[PDB]
Design a protein around this ligand. Structure first.
Ligand SMILES: [Zn+2]
Ligand SMILES: [Zn+2]
Lengths: 226, 198
């Protein structure tokens, strides 16, 4: 009941403010500030994620938001180009809640884990391009998650909500780069990418950074948390 | 093109007075285009209802699904849906450009865009429209019909009238800030009362 960081479920876990500091430090190093950059934020649509989006916009005045269910990126390549209209910073995060150690973290990720648990993971592993019209964002997310879970050969019997949440982060990150490739020419602009897992510790807000880098002058440099 | 057009704050006056007739404050779902310029009506809506959630997609597409609507409805209910126009809705103008140059399916590289694009095609073909003749305010108005029953399909999947009052405010946002309303009703204690302004 002190630092409330038994959240080592994600080794990289930081305070959200601690987190935001490192970012603008690392980002200032590469020429990014609230001065010259536009931020795109992508979180889950749920209201519990608003604290992270607010911190980011506190630093980045020029900002646009593309939140999808469970953090899925259904705005696509047009949704992205719409917002960027020379220095861009993309933040993408799924999100999880942990008491100490346990209204619903991520609603989508909860239902999905169950889906993978009761039915197969195989039931959801569809060809990309397909969705249930009754639940477009959710099912697009299931499937991408399913493909990803199969892609790094994961023992589903041993998959828990943190593990799933961490597959979502690798997934949402990968999708982000696929849009970024279509929508951003590293010859024309410099940009950055910050991804990770948002963690609601109900009261303290944490963030576990995952993949971070800058593409400056057509040259990519990775950034770890310290 | 939009004979229903009003100023946006007049609208938000008639709307809240109308709604006040049965309900007032109530949670609110807002669904507009992701574009920034839609924020005018957003904040005005929130202005009246502090309990809210937003479900914006490209052009106003309701890809939030039933689960999206259910997650937001956990604290009776009132639903706002509007596409828009002025670069008006870059999305509708992109679909329009398309409709005049060319089932649970989508481009992975533009899911919201192409989902809406499909739902408009169906609305276009249903209503029996000449695409050569279709222009931007026509498709916008279509999109208002598309977005509305979409919303409606989502609603009494998500909402049980025997237990909840809900309300529906739809229409078209117009910039040069105007709102041309369209389908507006309340359902209270069971009884559905459509609303026309004026
Ligand atoms: Zn969520
Ligand atoms: Zn638009």
């Amino acid at each position: 009941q002190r630092h409330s960081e038994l959240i080592k479920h994600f080794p990289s876990t930081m305070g959200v403010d601690d987190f935001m500091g490192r970012v603008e430090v690392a980002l200032a190093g590469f020429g990014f500030t609230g001065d010259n950059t536009i931020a795109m934020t992508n979180l889950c649509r749920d209201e519990v994620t608003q604290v992270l989006k607010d911190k980011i916009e506190a630093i980045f005045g020029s900002s646009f938001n593309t939140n999808g269910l469970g953090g899925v990126l259904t705005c696509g390549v047009t949704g992205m180009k719409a917002g960027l209209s020379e220095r861009y910073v993309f933040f993408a995060f799924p999100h999880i809640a942990i008491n100490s150690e346990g209204s619903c973290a991520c609603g989508a990720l909860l239902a999905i884990l169950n889906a993978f648990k009761v039915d197969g993971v195989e039931k959801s592993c569809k060809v990309p391009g397909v969705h249930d019209p009754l639940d477009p964002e959710l099912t697009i997310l299931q499937q991408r998650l399913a493909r990803r879970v199969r892609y790094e050969k994961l023992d589903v019997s041993k998959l828990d909500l943190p593990g799933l949440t961490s597959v979502a982060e690798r997934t949402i990150t990968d999708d982000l780069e696929y849009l970024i490739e279509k929508a951003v020419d590293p010859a024309v602009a410099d940009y950055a990418v910050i991804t990770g897992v948002q963690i609601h510790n109900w009261s303290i807000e944490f963030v576990a950074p995952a993949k971070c880098y800058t593409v400056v002058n057509g040259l990519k440099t990775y950034i770890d948390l310290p």
